[PDB]
């Protein structure tokens, strides 16, 4: 390890870079519990 | 000098061990001062009475089982009576009449 202080990522870029059905829907900039529900169901 | 660790011996299969460190003081060995009385500062500060040579001896009521060559070194179990103390460690010869 390198540091005692924790850190996290607050987003994840999509797998497919260019898809029209996503460019329109998403359009300042373009910058969990479902599975938690899943595991108990 | 003399070490007593098993880092230089082989394995039960005959393998040669490979060095990963150097000699450490906790494996100290010492030159056997044959009792044909000094003191040695052992670990933890205790003292060992190293009897270099000695002739008198307490006993209670010609042959060495280990090495015939020793026949006049004084060691435990030697016949002279049979010595029962460790003269090289305790610093005196204590034996019993056969």
């Amino acid at each position: 390890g390198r540091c005692l202080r924790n850190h996290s990522i607050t987003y994840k870029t999509p797998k497919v870079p260019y898809e029209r059905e996503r460019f329109d829907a998403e359009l300042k900039n373009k910058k969990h519990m479902r599975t938690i529900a899943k595991v108990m169901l | 000098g003399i070490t007593r660790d098993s880092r230089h011996k082989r394995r039960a299969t005959g393998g040669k061990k490979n060095s990963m460190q150097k000699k450490k003081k906790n494996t100290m060995g010492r030159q056997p001062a044959n009792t044909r009385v000094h003191d040695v500062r052992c670990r933890y500060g205790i003292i060992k009475r190293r009897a270099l040579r000695l002739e008198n001896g307490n006993f209670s009521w010609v042959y060495n089982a280990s090495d015939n060559d020793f026949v006049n070194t004084l060691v435990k179990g030697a016949i002279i009576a049979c010595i029962s103390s460790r003269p090289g460690q305790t610093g005196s010869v204590e034996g019993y009449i056969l």
Binding site: - | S6, K9, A12, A65, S66, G77
Partner: protein, 136 residues
Amino acid sequence: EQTERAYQKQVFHHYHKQIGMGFVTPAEAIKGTYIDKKCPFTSDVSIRGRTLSGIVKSCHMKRTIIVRRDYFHYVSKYQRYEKRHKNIAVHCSPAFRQLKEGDHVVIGQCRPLSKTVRFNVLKFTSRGTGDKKQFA
């Protein structure tokens, strides 16, 4: 037994003790004339925590035999086991005379007795004859 350069003698000279957790001193230990400084029952060597078993692989060594252990090793990726073995040298007192290769022996852990020997035979069970009656 006095076939060596020193007058062999017992450890507590004035003797037979008994081992601990649910064991029985063999008959040959008491009446036997053998002088053994490393015998569990007629000396000052005890049996501490560990306790294993196995079959006897070799009975050629003087007052020592080889116990073979077979077990399994589960391997995560394939969800399967593989046969494995380990051999340990065990000191065996002359209190057991019928003991031969191929028998099943309960052993216990004692203090370091040699470069390899660290255990003592406690209770043995004989098996079928492996065509060679090789004893201690």
